[PDB]
Amino acid sequence: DYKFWYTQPVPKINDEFNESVNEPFISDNKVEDVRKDEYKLPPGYSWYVCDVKDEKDRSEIYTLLTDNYVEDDDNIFRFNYSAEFLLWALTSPNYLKTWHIGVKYDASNKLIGFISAIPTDICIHKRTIKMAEVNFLCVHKTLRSKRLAPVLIKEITRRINLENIWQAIYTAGVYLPKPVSDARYYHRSINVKKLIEIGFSTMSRAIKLYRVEDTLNIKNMRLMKKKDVEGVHKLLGSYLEQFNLYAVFTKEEIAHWFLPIENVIYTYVNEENGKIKDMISFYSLPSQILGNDKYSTLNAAYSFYNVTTTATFKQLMQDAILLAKRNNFDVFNALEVMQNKSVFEDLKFGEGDGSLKYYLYNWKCASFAPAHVGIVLL
Ligand SMILES: CCCCCCCCCCCCCC(=O)SCCNC(=O)CCNC(=O)[C@H](O)C(C)(C)COP(=O)(O)OP(=O)(O)OC[C@H]1O[C@@H](n2cnc3c(N)ncnc32)[C@H](O)[C@@H]1OP(=O)(O)O
Ligand SMILES: CNCCCN(C)c1ncc(F)c(N2CC(C(=O)NCc3cnc4ccccn34)C2)n1
């Protein structure tokens, strides 16, 4: 039925659009028409504008997500975004504090709901649109199935619309109406012994079969530094234009999203005499291991953006796995987007247990295979 989503400007469950269609569902929107007041919450609940740069607010967001965010189908792991990651994820250039929205339970004064968006230029079927990138929607486990998620979505939609922005992009593992693209995920084992020991995935033969060659194919790769921003902007910017869906980065956005932050985002570059010719990037999202004696955290690296001009893509992604190993990661994760599907079998990737769906809000266009997706969300 999709009681809530049936009222939103999104395609229907079985919709299909011709290849020549690329337009909003609802256009000619006026800012003056947006509801000026916040939507009413149920009794005992209060809106709370979060200041992610304030330690207390950021600590409360972290605690909510650490306890109540996405778990695997068997409840063995829970995503454990670090507070520094959340700051990086939510304070991109031109971000709006009023787009970090929480809900507090009045009787305990605790954050029980959260949703967030950041502004970004999204290029969909070669048309660039100012959108909001929605992420980190979370409702406390004690309050699930209370219809709190729709009012979070409607309120952040209101605060996005008040900025004259009428489109949005978001990803989710669940099937909603209706994915513009759908990308399965794959896993490259690094610490084999640990992955079996925690239930993530011959013991001695497997340790040898999935070994990671200890030598890079691109010898010059070093951690990105701020002088590399222009080169990375040029390299990544021209690479992404070949896809049906990607973000249009400014130099400022290149600096924010790719300059290294320990345990958050790792970007390596091949800088030959000041020319950025190759880049490897992946971000750190550890998963809390629920109720395990030996291990507490699974250190997982997530493929971000990788561009190569002096080598093949298989060689580029081969170095990415080794660079993740050298940073003490247990597993290297990747979606079948961009050129990633072509390297999965030769680099011994294991197929995942599900897929990540890409969505556009208030945009009507034909869907496409994930190889035409050129954007990776956090
Ligand atoms: C122009 C700007 C527009 C901006 C807005 C753009 C859209 C943004 C959309 C959000 C982008 C999110 C991006 C991410 O962060 S994806 C991250 C998703 N977060 C989690 O899974 C964390 C763990 N789970 C939870 O915290 C809760 O289960 C959540 C909050 C996810 C569901 O809460 P709850 O379990 O208490 O449910 P309810 O009774 O309140 O509400 C029931 C309705 O909620 C719909 N639902 C369930 N899961 C999702 C989901 N992942 N995206 C969108 N909708 C979802 C569902 O179809 C149903 O609608 P309908 O079937 O009746 O129609
Ligand atoms: C990084 N965006 C987080 C939210 C969007 N989503 C659901 C998502 N985006 C990209 C992915 F690549 C991805 N997947 C990799 C697969 C995976 O690692 N599965 C085992 C596992 C370990 N820890 C957890 C915690 C929760 C669920 C599964 N877990 C699932 N999921």
Numbering used by the authors: 27 to 227, 234 to 410
The authors write:
One such protein, N-myristoyltransferase (PvNMT), is an essential enzyme that catalyzes a post-translational modification (myristoylation) through transfer of the lipid myristate from myristoyl coenzyme A (Myr-CoA) to the N-terminal glycine residues of target proteins. NMT-mediated myristoylation is crucial for membrane association, protein–protein interactions, protein stability and turnover, and signal transduction. Plasmodium species possess a single NMT gene that is essential for survival, and previous studies showed reduced parasitemia after NMT inhibition. PvNMT has a prototypical NMT topology and adopts a compact, spherical configuration consisting of 15 α-helices and 19 β-sheets.
The co-crystal structure of PvNMT with a cofactor (Myr-CoA) and a peptide-binding-domain inhibitor (IMP-0001173) was determined at 2.3 Å resolution. Interestingly, the asymmetric unit contains two copies of PvNMT: an apo PvNMT and a ternary complex with IMP-0001173 and Myr-CoA. PvNMT has a central core with an internal pseudo-twofold symmetry axis formed by the N-terminal and C-terminal halves, shaping the site for binding peptide substrates. All of the loops near the binding cavity are ordered in the monomer with bound Myr-CoA and IMP-0001173, whereas the loops nearest the binding cavities are disordered in the apo PvNMT monomer. The partly ordered apo PvNMT is the only reported apo PvNMT structure in the PDB. The myristoyl-binding pocket of PvNMT preferentially binds glycine residues, ensuring its substrate specificity. In our structure, Myr-CoA occupies the extended groove that runs across one face of the enzyme. The postulated catalytic mechanism starts with the formation of a stable complex with Myr-CoA, while the peptide-binding domain of NMT accepts the N-terminus of the substrate protein. The Ab-loop above the peptide-binding pocket adopts an closed or open conformation to control access to the active site by forming a ceiling or lid.
